[PDB]
Design a protein around this ligand. Structure first.
Ligand SMILES: Nc1ncnc2c1ncn2[C@@H]1O[C@H](COP(=O)(O)OP(=O)(O)OP(=O)(O)O)[C@@H](O)[C@H]1O
Ligand SMILES: Nc1ncnc2c1ncn2[C@@H]1O[C@H](COP(=O)(O)OP(=O)(O)OP(=O)(O)O)[C@@H](O)[C@H]1O
Lengths: 113, 180, 346, 434, 415
């Protein structure tokens, strides 16, 4: 669920910053807590098994972070088959949010022999 | 494609049963058919009624009203002139009157019994004081109370008031009971 | 003091209604107020514009979108009210209460009363508005939850200077109808009409697109000496009108969906602008026909499978849509639209 | 310039924040108000413990009477009464005892300037007097539920045994209060249930409107003109404003609901000169009423585009042909295809109406679910309480996993209402029927 | 200001359980004098004086202890509907016996150790009253068991008195383990008869009926024995008060309240006629109290509803009689409302009523799908408790069901 997603994300974000030297208020307060800008890279390890409604809500939730001037977010999608499953399952509003800045790369072990 | 279908139902009720029983039981104790046949032959012999413009106009509205409650096929519109001409013949009037058309429409409606028929499922109410009756009576009483004094007279004839409002007796009787 | 009315177009009834329920006298403003409108109806924008038009007002902004559940919702209210009261009246010596100790609504009432007691020495009564945007957008929500926010003002000491005048915004209508008998003063927002959406997007994105790097690169490449910002705006407006007329049936009268098509097709549309297309939008449309014939909202041999995999899928589709009755009839030598049924491995 | 004082006076009068001296009680309320006043003063002055519950629907000026009476007593009986407030919506059964303790402590402190808890309340009162305690409870029915009734049980028990007088006034909308109050609490309760009176005459509502809009302070010289115009508009039964008043009465008879519409009219008024014209014709209440209805089914249906409307019509047709009334995206798109084929087939051909792709329709399908035209087959909807909402947010239904195009939906608008609402000039009006 | 008390004040300010008192005292005396431990079980309807009789026995036993007919003993009173949490019973009992402030787990073990292990000669007899015993029932029923189980210990010297709603509760709800220990020691209280209530009323007013008072003519203040005034309450008024109450319930408090209400009504008449020689409380004063107890506000409230609510109720009743069922589909209801509006003619009054109901009578803004304030009246009939609805966000497949009787709604509509 979105609640568990945000809680675990903030937990890991705090744990990582603890070695420098649970909610969006942590993201707001990060620059005053550690004096540095925050860049987040999100690794969706297996997209097909993820509840796409929960993922869509989580993406909309993360969209609120752009109000902060010191936060940058990157998204990594491990796709097994194709963009077709994402286009079928996600809402067409969230697809437009993703598509404004995306890259497509075929990392399969088989490529033209 | 029939012209008239009559739903002649029997309801168990002591009062109507008494009326029918007292009509029947006293008949077998102890106009004539000749004149009836004479009248029937005469009317068919002489009168050939023609539909008037005003009588024609009401057919459109009656058929549209039967239509919008949709089994109101075009077949019943044949009856809406067949019965009118027969009514004009029975009156012996040489033309079909608007009253004749309205009576024929009423006869068709009563035969089919649409007013007691459920428009949703086609079922029939068994019974055929209500809040809509209360509201209509209250509004009518208020309107007649306003009108009876809005005119430059303290009182007026009830026929003129009825024609002015309907275009009633119970409401005015109740007002009289209240000395209004 | 008298409130000044903003000039928000396509909302010139609600901006006047807000002047009815919001005023400098805390004895006039009601204890509750709800603004109702679906997504993209302009509620947040209109309310923020109204508050920015009258700086003398005092407000707190929170988003249940960020505040996942009700406990953060109360904690943020307490913390932000404490900070705002310190900001507004630094001169008054005051102490602190922990905003992280709020576990139940009664504890919120207790903390609020304790804080307001400190400011009892205020000269005049103060009108404070707490703004929660999208109350029904809360992720963990229930019907009994909203009742706890309506009848909260009267648990305060009514003689206190600080009066909380809550403001809520709601999206749905199945939510608000549950509370009709409370007769809360409610202001409504309808969906924008097609003409309204067309005018609003032109008013909004024209300046955003008149200054993008791609067009001023392509102007240099094409050596457009006579290009002016007035013609720049006209080109952008032509682009927006073309997208609207081509995709209104696809998106509806929705501002958000059209904005993203305007963003996506904008580079490709720019790529077709040349010396010949400066003054003839018809020719540019002709050159850009293939861009309009396709939505291009798609994220893009469709499934690379072994022969065994392909035949397994073919058999599985038969299993999930053919009755078990016909297996022996068809395969032994002796529906397009319904949901698929289950089948066994054998 | 000076009209602002009169406008502020009127707005304050509308909101009921007048000083207790200037406060007004309606004639249909006065009979119960005097009875409540009698009970309160007999409890305080004569030191008699008593218990009362007010019953009636919401927005019935129910607790307003208690506020009026206590505000009146505050002017001349400052030391005599003690007030304790609780509300079942906010105060859970865990926090009620703490709320009582804290409120009692505050009241005692400002006056001076667990059976043992109640016993200590009585001991503190006795030791500080050597003062009648008035409990006011909102929503008795909330405490009177599956929660084991202890707090009200103790308060009603104290009526007989308290050395310091105890008075209880409650509120509840339910007419079946005695069902919620169990037999033990019923026995301990004094059972003087007061059901509030209802507005039952048009003259009653007209007099209430006069009481609300009357100005009895000579703040401005145009106060006389205000009262004159008000009586002009209330004198003729066929008045434009009286038309709205009668319609409101005949629709619903809660006066605060009508006040909720009158207040915008007064506040929106800019000056007395414009107010004189605005109050007479009173065309703004129509605008208010249409705004109140702008987000129902009709208002949402009026804004959809041609493609959205056509897909809605097709889905409604599918539901109509369905015994269960359900439909899915595939059937809706198939009916869309068939209707477009039929429309194109009724056109003369060429001598030598786009069938939208199944992918572009997905946005329209999403829009038709956002705007509450569609709903899931077994959509429970909004949960009543937080405990059930937690489980609902936990469990994942079938509709969250099945494909987008195979999610079953049902319809909120029947094709009869479609044909009633959709203009005849619409190009798909002919397909509104079967 | 001085507390002004009228002639009726003493009537409002102000014997039938001797057999029960003797039975409880005899059992209690036998157990206490023998230095034994046992359980006493009490049950009965509310208002019959179960608690009052127990208190009278305990006070008399204390008097016997003062006379040293029986040795010293300690009394502890606990009520089930007064504790905040069930575990507080263990802490309270240990605190009253030993004065310690240990936790509930420690107190329960301490109580278990105290009653079982401590020698009898090192103890004081303890009598514990568990009022509202059935309110202490937990999931494991430990409170129902442990307190009674301690009485089985010969070293306990503990007497436990329990008050519950029903006599057969151990058989109906509790296990056989607790039922056997409680045993035959059960006593049931029966509601009073009308003549017993009349006697109790007269007992409270023994020195006030037919008594004279000195009443200040300027203020109405009265002193029991400025002019001489007499007071009386009619025996027929008391008889009808006692008979009517006894036919409803055995609660003795109701009879006292009825007389208090009757005295207040007579007091109101006295004040109204004077506007501040025998003041006889007439039977009409009592009948006013009885009528307000019997009469229901439901019918008059429903008759006082707006036209919309009555129309809704009538449509629902018509749907019930057409369908032969109680609950009806909500969309069916909103369609039947339109059917009932349109079944009438095209008369101008009908047209105006329909325009007001369906499109608010607005100038041009129209075409609503449902009547105005339909949601308002649907929520009003539901918050009042008259109308019941099951919760779904599908507005038109939901069912609407009535709480009131099928008969009285028609009665209200026909008035
Ligand atoms: N009259 C207007 N003039 C100019 N821009 C407008 C107008 N109305 C709406 N907008 C634009 O439309 C946008 C719609 O977003 P808005 O702030 O209204 O979101 P929302 O509907 O409150 O949000 P959510 O759907 O997430 O609950 C506004 O941000 C604003 O830029
Ligand atoms: N202190 C107050 N000052 C002015 N008006 C008040 C005050 N308290 C309540 N009101 C009025 O009360 C009305 C709202 O309904 P009200 O407070 O009477 O219901 P309630 O008793 O809380 O209802 P419920 O049955 O839901 O408990 C409004 O018209 C408001 O003006």
């Amino acid at each position: 669920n979105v609640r568990m997603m945000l809680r675990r994300s903030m937990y890991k974000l705090y744990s990582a910053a603890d070695a420098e030297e649970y909610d969006l208020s942590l993201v707001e307060n990060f620059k005053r807590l550690f004096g540095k800008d925050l860049a987040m890279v999100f690794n969706f390890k297996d997209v097909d098994s993820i509840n796409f409604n929960t993922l869509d809500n989580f993406i909309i939730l993360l969209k609120s972070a752009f109000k902060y001037d010191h936060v940058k977010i990157s998204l990594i999608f491990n796709i097994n088959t194709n963009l077709s499953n994402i286009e079928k399952n996600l809402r067409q509003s969230t697809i437009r949010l993703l598509k404004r800045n995306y890259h497509k790369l075929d990392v399969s072990s088989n490529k033209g022999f | 494609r029939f012209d008239l279908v009559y739903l002649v139902l029997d309801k168990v009720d002591e009062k109507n049963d008494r009326e029918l029983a007292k009509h029947l039981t006293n008949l077998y104790l102890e106009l004539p058919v000749e004149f009836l046949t004479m009248y029937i032959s005469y009317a068919k012999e002489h009168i050939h009624p023609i539909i008037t413009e005003a009588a024609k106009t009401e057919l459109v509205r009656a058929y549209v009203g039967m239509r919008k409650m949709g089994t109101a096929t075009t077949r019943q519109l044949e009856s809406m002139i067949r019965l009118a001409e027969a009514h004009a013949k029975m009156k012996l009037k040489n033309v079909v009157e608007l009253e004749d058309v309205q009576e024929a429409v009423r006869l068709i409606r009563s035969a089919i019994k649409d007013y007691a028929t459920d428009p949703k499922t086609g079922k029939i109410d068994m019974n055929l004081k209500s809040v809509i009756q209360r509201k209509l009576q209250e509004d009518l009483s208020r309107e007649i109370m306003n009108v009876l004094k809005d005119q430059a007279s303290d009182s007026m004839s009830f026929n003129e008031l009825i024609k002015q409002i309907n275009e009633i007796q119970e409401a005015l009787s109740r007002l009289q009971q209240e000395d209004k | 003091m008298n409130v000044t009315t903003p000039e928000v177009a396509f909302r010139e009834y609600q901006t006047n209604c807000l002047a009815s329920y919001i005023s400098a006298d805390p004895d006039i403003t009601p204890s509750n107020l709800i603004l109702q409108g679906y997504s993209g109806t302009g509620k947040t924008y209109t309310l923020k514009k109204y508050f920015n038009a009258n700086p003398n007002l005092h407000a707190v902004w929170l988003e249940p979108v960020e505040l996942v559940s009700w406990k953060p919702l109360l904690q943020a209210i307490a913390r932000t009210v404490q900070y705002k009261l310190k900001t507004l009246y630094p001169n008054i010596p005051t102490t602190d209460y922990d905003p992280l100790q709020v576990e139940e609504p009664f504890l919120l009432v207790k903390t609020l009363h304790n804080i307001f007691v400190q400011y009892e020495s205020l000269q005049e009564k103060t009108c404070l508005f707490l703004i929660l945007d999208g109350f029904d957008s809360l992720q963990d929500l229930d019907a009994a939850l909203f009742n706890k926010y309506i009848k909260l003002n009267e648990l305060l000491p009514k003689d206190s200077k600080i009066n909380i005048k809550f403001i809520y915004t709601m999206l749905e209508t199945s939510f608000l109808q549950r509370y009709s008998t409370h007769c809360i003063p409610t202001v409504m927002f309808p969906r924008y009409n097609v003409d309204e959406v067309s005018t609003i997007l032109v008013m909004s994105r024209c300046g955003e697109l008149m200054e993008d790097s791609c067009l001023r690169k392509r102007i240099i490449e094409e050596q457009i000496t006579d290009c002016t910002d007035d013609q720049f705006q006209n080109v952008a407006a032509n682009f927006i009108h073309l997208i609207v007329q081509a995709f209104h049936s696809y998106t509806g009268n929705d501002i958000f969906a059209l904005n993203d098509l305007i963003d996506f097709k904008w580079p490709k549309y720019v790529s077709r602008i040349t010396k010949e297309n400066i003054f003839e939008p018809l020719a540019l449309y002709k050159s850009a026909i293939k861009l309009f014939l396709s939505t291009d909202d798609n994220l893009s041999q469709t499934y690379d499978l072994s022969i065994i995999s392909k035949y397994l899928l073919i058999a599985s589709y038969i299993c999930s849509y053919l009755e078990p009755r016909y297996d022996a009839s068809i395969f032994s030598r002796k529906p397009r639209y319904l949901q698929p049924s289950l089948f066994a491995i054998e | 310039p000076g009209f602002g004082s009169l406008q502020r006076r009127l707005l304050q009068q509308l909101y009921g924040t007048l000083p207790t001296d200037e406060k007004i009680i309606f004639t249909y309320l006065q009979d119960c108000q005097q009875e409540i006043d009698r009970i309160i003063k007999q409890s305080i002055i004569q030191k008699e413990s008593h218990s009362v519950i007010l019953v009636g629907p919401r927005q019935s000026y129910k607790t307003y009477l208690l506020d009026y009476e206590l505000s009146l007593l505050q002017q001349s009986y400052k030391e005599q009464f003690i007030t304790i407030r609780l509300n079942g919506f906010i105060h859970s059964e865990q926090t009620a005892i703490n709320g009582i303790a804290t409120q009692l402590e505050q009241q005692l402190q400002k006056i001076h300037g667990l059976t043992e808890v109640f016993e200590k309340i009585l001991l503190l009162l006795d030791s500080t007097t050597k003062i009648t305690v008035v409990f006011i409870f909102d929503e008795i029915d909330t405490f009177a539920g599956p929660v084991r009734q202890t707090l009200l049980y103790n308060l009603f028990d104290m009526v007989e045994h308290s050395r310091v007088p105890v008075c209880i006034f409650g509120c509840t909308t339910k007419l079946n209060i005695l069902e919620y109050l169990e037999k033990r609490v019923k026995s301990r309760f004094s059972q003087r249930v007061i059901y509030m009176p209802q507005i039952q005459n048009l003259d009653d509502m007209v007099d209430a409107v006069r009481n609300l809009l009357t100005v009895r302070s000579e703040i401005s010289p145009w106060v006389s003109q205000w009262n004159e115009t008000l009586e002009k508009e209330l004198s003729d039964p066929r008045s434009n404003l009286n038309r709205h008043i009668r319609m409101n009465f005949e629709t619903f008879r809660s006066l605060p609901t009508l006040k909720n519409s009158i207040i915008p009219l007064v506040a929106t008024s800019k000056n007395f000169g414009s107010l004189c014209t605005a109050i007479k014709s009173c065309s703004f209440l129509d605008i208010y009423n249409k705004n109140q209805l702008s987000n129902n089914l009709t208002g949402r249906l009026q804004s959809l585009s041609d493609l959205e409307l056509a897909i809605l019509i097709s889905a409604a047709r599918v539901a109509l042909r369905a015994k269960d009334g359900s439909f899915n995206f595939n059937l809706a798109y198939a009916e869309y295809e068939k209707m477009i084929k039929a429309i194109n087939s009724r056109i003369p051909t060429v001598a030598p109406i786009k069938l939208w792709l199944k992918k572009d329709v997905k946005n329209v399908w999403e829009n038709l679910v956002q705007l509450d035209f569609f709903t899931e087959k077994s959509a429970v909807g909004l949960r009543d309480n937080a405990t059930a909402a937690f489980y609902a947010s936990n469990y994942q239904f079938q509709g969250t996993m099945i494909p987008f195009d195979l999610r079953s939906y049902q319809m909120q608008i029947i094709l009869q209402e479609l044909r009633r609402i959709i203009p005849k000039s619409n190009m798909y009006y002919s397909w509104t029927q079967l | 200001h001085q507390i002004v008390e009228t002639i009726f004040s003493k009537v409002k300010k102000q014997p039938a359980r001797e057999n029960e008192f003797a039975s409880i005292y005899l059992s209690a005396y036998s157990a206490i004098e023998s230095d034994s431990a046992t359980t006493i079980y009490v049950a009965g309807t509310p208002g019959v004086g179960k608690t009052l009789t127990v208190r009278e026995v305990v006070k008399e036993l204390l008097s016997s202890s003062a006379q040293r007919e029986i040795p010293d003993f300690l009394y502890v009173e606990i009520n089930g509907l007064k504790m905040v949490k069930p575990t507080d019973c263990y802490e309270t009992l240990w605190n009253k016996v030993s004065g310690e402030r240990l936790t509930w787990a420690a107190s329960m073990e301490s109580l278990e150790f105290y009653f079982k292990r401590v020698p009898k000669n090192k103890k004081k007899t303890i009598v514990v009253l568990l009022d509202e015993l059935d309110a202490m029932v937990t999931k494991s029923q430990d409170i129902m068991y442990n307190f009674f189980n301690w009485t089985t210990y010969e070293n306990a010297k503990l007497i436990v008195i329990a008050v519950a709603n029903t006599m057969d509760l151990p058989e109906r709800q509790l296990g056989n383990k607790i039922t056997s220990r409680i045993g035959f020691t059960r006593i049931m209280f029966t509601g009073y008869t009308h003549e017993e209530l009349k006697n109790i009323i007269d007992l409270r007013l023994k020195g006030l009926n037919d008594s004279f008072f000195y009443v200040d003519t300027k203020t109405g203040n009265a002193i029991l024995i400025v002019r001489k005034v007499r007071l009386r309450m009619s025996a027929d008024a008391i008889e009808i008060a006692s008979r009517k109450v006894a036919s409803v319930s055995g609660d003795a408090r109701r009879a006292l309240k009825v007389c208090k209400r009757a005295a207040e009504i007579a007091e109101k008449h006295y004040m109204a006629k004077h506007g501040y020689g025998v003041q006889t409380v007439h039977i009409t004063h009592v009948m006013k109290a009885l009528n307000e107890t019997l009469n229901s506000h439901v019918i008059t409230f429903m008759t006082r509803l707006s036209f919309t609510a009555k129309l809704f109720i009538y449509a629902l009743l018509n749907l019930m009689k057409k369908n032969g069922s109680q609950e009806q589909e909500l969309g069916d209801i909103v369609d039947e409302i339109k059917l009932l509006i349109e079944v009438n003619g095209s008369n101008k009054f009908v047209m105006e009523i329909a325009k007001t109901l369906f499109q608010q009578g607005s100038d041009n803004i129209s075409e609503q799908l449902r009547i105005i304030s339909w949601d308002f009246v649907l929520n009003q009939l539901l918050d009042a408790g008259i109308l019941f609805k099951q919760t779904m966000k599908n507005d038109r497949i939901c069912c609407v069901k009535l709480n009131i009787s099928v008969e009285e709604a028609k009665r209200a509509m026909n008035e």
